[PDB]
Design an enzyme around this catalytic site. Structure first.
Site, PDB file in Angstrom:
ATOM      1  N   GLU A  64       8.776 -23.026  64.891  1.00 55.04           N
ATOM      2  CA  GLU A  64       8.618 -22.303  66.192  1.00 55.04           C
ATOM      3  C   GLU A  64       6.720 -22.398  66.337  1.00 55.04           C
ATOM      4  O   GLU A  64       5.947 -22.390  65.309  1.00 55.04           O
ATOM      5  CB  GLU A  64       8.858 -20.963  65.769  1.00 55.04           C
ATOM      6  CG  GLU A  64       8.476 -19.925  66.991  1.00 55.04           C
ATOM      7  CD  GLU A  64       9.035 -20.354  68.396  1.00 55.04           C
ATOM      8  OE1 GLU A  64       9.893 -21.247  68.238  1.00 55.04           O
ATOM      9  OE2 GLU A  64       8.965 -19.351  69.202  1.00 55.04           O
ATOM     10  N   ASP A  92      13.559 -22.053  63.762  1.00 55.72           N
ATOM     11  CA  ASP A  92      12.119 -21.526  63.808  1.00 55.72           C
ATOM     12  C   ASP A  92      11.288 -21.456  62.474  1.00 55.72           C
ATOM     13  O   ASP A  92      10.246 -21.808  62.467  1.00 55.72           O
ATOM     14  CB  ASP A  92      12.437 -19.790  64.125  1.00 55.72           C
ATOM     15  CG  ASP A  92      12.939 -19.721  65.545  1.00 55.72           C
ATOM     16  OD1 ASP A  92      12.910 -20.476  66.387  1.00 55.72           O
ATOM     17  OD2 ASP A  92      14.020 -18.878  65.721  1.00 55.72           O
ATOM     18  N   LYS A 118      24.545 -16.345  69.053  1.00 56.30           N
ATOM     19  CA  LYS A 118      23.877 -17.422  68.565  1.00 56.30           C
ATOM     20  C   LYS A 118      24.693 -18.099  67.479  1.00 56.30           C
ATOM     21  O   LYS A 118      24.837 -19.187  67.220  1.00 56.30           O
ATOM     22  CB  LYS A 118      22.742 -16.555  67.581  1.00 56.30           C
ATOM     23  CG  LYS A 118      21.486 -17.614  67.698  1.00 56.30           C
ATOM     24  CD  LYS A 118      20.251 -16.764  67.177  1.00 56.30           C
ATOM     25  CE  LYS A 118      19.096 -16.748  68.166  1.00 56.30           C
ATOM     26  NZ  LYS A 118      18.799 -18.215  68.826  1.00 56.30           N
TER      27      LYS A 118
HETATM   28 MN   LIG Z   1      15.082 -17.987  67.498  1.00 55.72          MN
END
Ligand SMILES: [Mn+2]
Length: 178
Positions: A64, A92, A118
């Site tokens: 990220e 991430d 998710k």
């Molecule tokens: Mn995320």
DNA sequence: TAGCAT
């Protein structure tokens, strides 16, 4: 010129604000117009960085916050050197201690709603999911929460503070309901 | 892409 935009710029440090602005522009989008997306992206960045600060010193590779091309390059270096499965969506962090990618998410709905979305919309099985709410709940793959309680607790505290700052400015209802 | 919408 929205209140939400000026709120975001005084709520998050400049480095997070610059990475957020770049992420929306890298996908040809306008922080000035899409102000709820601006706040969500800043929030997601801040949690990812707070999360990576919670480990021992070399524990995580940060994905990220990098340019997309460099993000995938670093993901490919990890997959090629560890043999771990190449995720379908950009994760991430990479946890060198537990040898898995982490996808962090922040939600104003019940934690399990975003977790399940998710846990499908990403499919790529081996990726660890860790969801935080703005009400101090969390939910992670296999109830394995990765960090010490103190490191998660300071994230939950910061998210409730962002919520109260938005609510004291009459931006929470708009944000929660968008 | 964030994550709420659908
Ligand atoms: Mn995320």
């Amino acid at each position: 010129g929205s209140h939400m935009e000026d709120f975001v710029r005084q709520c998050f440090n400049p480095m997070i604000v610059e990475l957020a602005e770049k992420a929306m522009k890298e996908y040809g989008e306008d922080p000035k117009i899409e102000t709820n997306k601006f706040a969500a992206i800043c929030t997601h960045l801040e949690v990812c960085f707070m999360y990576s600060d919670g480990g021992s010193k070399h524990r995580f590779e940060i994905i990220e916050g990098r340019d997309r091309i460099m993000a995938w390059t670093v993901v490919n270096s990890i997959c090629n050197t560890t043999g771990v499965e190449k995720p379908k969506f950009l994760p991430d962090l990479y946890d060198y201690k537990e040898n898995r990618f982490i996808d962090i998410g922040v939600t104003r709905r019940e934690v399990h709603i975003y977790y399940l979305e998710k846990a499908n919309k990403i499919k790529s099985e081996k990726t660890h999911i860790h969801i935080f709410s703005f009400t101090g709940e969390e939910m992670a793959t296999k109830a394995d929460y990765t960090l010490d309680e103190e490191s998660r607790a300071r994230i939950k505290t910061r998210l409730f503070t962002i919520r109260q700052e938005m609510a004291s400015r009459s931006l929470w209802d708009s944000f929660r309901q968008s």
